Each structure stands twice: as structure tokens, then as C-alpha cells.
Amino acid sequence: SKTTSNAGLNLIKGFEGKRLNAYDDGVGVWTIGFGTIKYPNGVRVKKGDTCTEQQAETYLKNDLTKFEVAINKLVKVSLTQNQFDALASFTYNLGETNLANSTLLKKLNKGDYQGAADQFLVWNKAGGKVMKGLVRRREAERALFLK
Amino acid sequence: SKTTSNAGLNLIKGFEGKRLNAYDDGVGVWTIGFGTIKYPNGVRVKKGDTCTEQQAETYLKNDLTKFEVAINKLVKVSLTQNQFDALASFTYNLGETNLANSTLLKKLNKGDYQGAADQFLVWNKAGGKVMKGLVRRREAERALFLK
Structure with a gap:
């Protein structure tokens, strides 16, 4: 793990x-x-x-430990260390419930790595407003996921 | 009602x-x-x-109607309109089951309005993560409840 x-x-x-x-x-x-x-x-x-x-x-x-535990429990396909690290940042920011319910995880566990990578970008909102900082963060996480 | x-x-x-x-x-x-x-x-x-x-x-x-119905069923003491509005925001965000099982509602229904107001603040977590936005929501709800 x-x-x-x-x-x-x-x-x-x-x-x-x-x-x-x-x-x-x-x-x-x-x-x-x-x-x-x-x-x-x-x-x-x-x-x-x-x-x-x-x-x-x-x-x-x-x-990070509780979120790492969550990721290792929830993800059912192989992860590169880059992909795990990107998910750790995402999950540390958004919590384990958002990861568990995410379309990101659904697609990931179907083996659809590219679709999962593109789902990082959906999570760019705080209070219904798209935040430029969250856009930059999700883009960095997606970039690491695809590295 | x-x-x-x-x-x-x-x-x-x-x-x-x-x-x-x-x-x-x-x-x-x-x-x-x-x-x-x-x-x-x-x-x-x-x-x-x-x-x-x-x-x-x-x-x-x-x-909001389903949450208003839940509040009017679950709360057994008087509410100012400010207190009702605070509970409407809280329950919209957290759901009827969380309100029903909350120490917030238990204290409120004993007539302990100050204790209930302080219980708003414990609901600041999502997926194991204390969220600044949730703290902000809870503090705003508490302040309206106490107004």
C-alpha cells in the first residue's frame, strides 16, 4: 500500500x-x-x-495518513506513484466522501484513467463560484496524474 | 408554521x-x-x-420545503424567524437525519437555546476534513440564531 x-x-x-x-x-x-x-x-x-x-x-x-488509507481502500485498479500522489492532494483538499462519491473514482475503477484524469478539473468550485486557485490546483493534480 | x-x-x-x-x-x-x-x-x-x-x-x-417540514416536525420549542432561518441553512446543508440525531436539537428541545447555538459550530467537517467554508457557514448560522 x-x-x-x-x-x-x-x-x-x-x-x-x-x-x-x-x-x-x-x-x-x-x-x-x-x-x-x-x-x-x-x-x-x-x-x-x-x-x-x-x-x-x-x-x-x-x-495525510487517513486520506491515504481511504485511497488505498477505494481505488481498485493499479496506480503509479504519481497517480497516488495526485489523488492524495485531491483527497486532502476535498475529503474522503467527495472522493468516494466522485465520478473521478467511478471512471478510475472502470480502468478509465484518462476519464478519471479529466474529472479532476470538475472540482474547481467553492460556494458555486469557479476559483482560479482551484482551477490551477486541479490542473496541477491532473498533470501529475498523467505524468 | x-x-x-x-x-x-x-x-x-x-x-x-x-x-x-x-x-x-x-x-x-x-x-x-x-x-x-x-x-x-x-x-x-x-x-x-x-x-x-x-x-x-x-x-x-x-x-427548502422538505427541510422546513423537517424543522417544524422536529423542533418542539419556540423559534424566532432568525433561528428558523439559521436551522433552515444548517439542515439544507446537512440533512434531516443529521439534525434529528444532533446534540443541537436535543439541547434546543430542552429549551437550551445557547447550548444549541454553540452546537452549530461542531458541524464543520466533510469527509474527515475540517473545512474553512463549513466553519464560515456554521458561524454565520450561529450568529443569525443568536440575533
């Missing part, structure tokens, strides 16, 4: 940004590193927390 | 957006207007459909 490799980690790190001081993510949930809100020991991130780059990467790798 | 007023309608329009051309939501469900997937005559939205803003408003008001 696969885990997220450096291609997927770099993708996600680019999207989350690097923040070594805890920050309000905009809705009052304190966050640090590359999108971490809870340390692997269960302690919640709080205002005033600081971390190192290595700690942030470890925390990201931990945050 | 109550129906959703302009306040709840604006809350829901906020996070559904407005799209007068039908679009795929990523799970193969074509969607139009303010999150409508089935017209009031039971006909499913399909690719190529278009509607006017007025039609979209009518369709959204129709979509």
Missing part, C-alpha cells in the same frame, strides 16, 4: 503554504506548518505555537 | 452561489440556479439546461 511521496508532498506544501508560526486560518481555527490543526499526539494547535520545517513536514505526513 | 425568510435564503445563496447554466458538481449530479438538482415537477436538472434568476429563486424556495 502506497503513501504520499515527495511529488504529492510538494504539491500540497505549495498549496497550504509554509507557516512556522501558528496562524488563524481565517475562520478562527489555529493552524501551523502545512495546514496542520492537530499534532499527532492529539494536542490542538493554538495561538503562539511555533514549529520547525522538519516538524511541519512530519505533521503534514501524519495529516 | 414558518418558512424560510430572506435571511436564510441569503445564507444559502451565499454558499451555493448562482449559476444559470447547469453544471456537474463532481458526483455526476447536474446542478443549476442556487444548488437545485431537481425541478419542482420532479424532472432532474440535466446538462444544457438554463434558467433565469427568477426561476432559480422559485426552485430554491421549493428545495
Whole structure:
């Protein structure tokens, strides 16, 4: 069973940004590193927390584990490491339920890799508006999937 | 018995957006207007459909009826219109079963309005992922509920 490799980690790190001081993510949930809100020991991130780059990467790798488990359970065809990494970014962003219900996964499990790759681009909306950042993200994920 | 007023309608329009051309939501469900997937005559939205803003408003008001019915059946205490509208947004987003089983409804039906208001905030997850947009929705619903 696969885990997220450096291609997927770099993708996600680019999207989350690097923040070594805890920050309000905009809705009052304190966050640090590359999108971490809870340390692997269960302690919640709080205002005033600081971390190192290595700690942030470890925390990201931990945050990914549940979504990696979901991908390994849900996908029933072979994946290149690039394809797994693209799905890890997609699923980290959108959650396991969106992956489980997606047309992407339906087509993927039929062996239709090209159709699945094109489904990444459908998920470009937040609040019904197409977001340029989500377009760029889905395009990067599709590009890695097809690499 | 109550129906959703302009306040709840604006809350829901906020996070559904407005799209007068039908679009795929990523799970193969074509969607139009303010999150409508089935017209009031039971006909499913399909690719190529278009509607006017007025039609979209009518369709959204129709979509809300099942959730309004659920709230009026499940809630056993008085509600201001603001509180009803907050619950309409919450239940539109999360569904009748989640409302029925919620600590939110349990506290509300004991007459514990402040406890219920605070329970809005725990419903900020999708597919194992805390979502900033969901936190925003829940905080807006709580604020309207408390107004």
C-alpha cells in the first residue's frame, strides 16, 4: 500500500503554504506548518505555537495518513506513484466522501484513467463560484496524474 | 408554521452561489440556479439546461420545503424567524437525519437555546476534513440564531 511521496508532498506544501508560526486560518481555527490543526499526539494547535520545517513536514505526513488509507481502500485498479500522489492532494483538499462519491473514482475503477484524469478539473468550485486557485490546483493534480 | 425568510435564503445563496447554466458538481449530479438538482415537477436538472434568476429563486424556495417540514416536525420549542432561518441553512446543508440525531436539537428541545447555538459550530467537517467554508457557514448560522 502506497503513501504520499515527495511529488504529492510538494504539491500540497505549495498549496497550504509554509507557516512556522501558528496562524488563524481565517475562520478562527489555529493552524501551523502545512495546514496542520492537530499534532499527532492529539494536542490542538493554538495561538503562539511555533514549529520547525522538519516538524511541519512530519505533521503534514501524519495529516495525510487517513486520506491515504481511504485511497488505498477505494481505488481498485493499479496506480503509479504519481497517480497516488495526485489523488492524495485531491483527497486532502476535498475529503474522503467527495472522493468516494466522485465520478473521478467511478471512471478510475472502470480502468478509465484518462476519464478519471479529466474529472479532476470538475472540482474547481467553492460556494458555486469557479476559483482560479482551484482551477490551477486541479490542473496541477491532473498533470501529475498523467505524468 | 414558518418558512424560510430572506435571511436564510441569503445564507444559502451565499454558499451555493448562482449559476444559470447547469453544471456537474463532481458526483455526476447536474446542478443549476442556487444548488437545485431537481425541478419542482420532479424532472432532474440535466446538462444544457438554463434558467433565469427568477426561476432559480422559485426552485430554491421549493428545495427548502422538505427541510422546513423537517424543522417544524422536529423542533418542539419556540423559534424566532432568525433561528428558523439559521436551522433552515444548517439542515439544507446537512440533512434531516443529521439534525434529528444532533446534540443541537436535543439541547434546543430542552429549551437550551445557547447550548444549541454553540452546537452549530461542531458541524464543520466533510469527509474527515475540517473545512474553512463549513466553519464560515456554521458561524454565520450561529450568529443569525443568536440575533
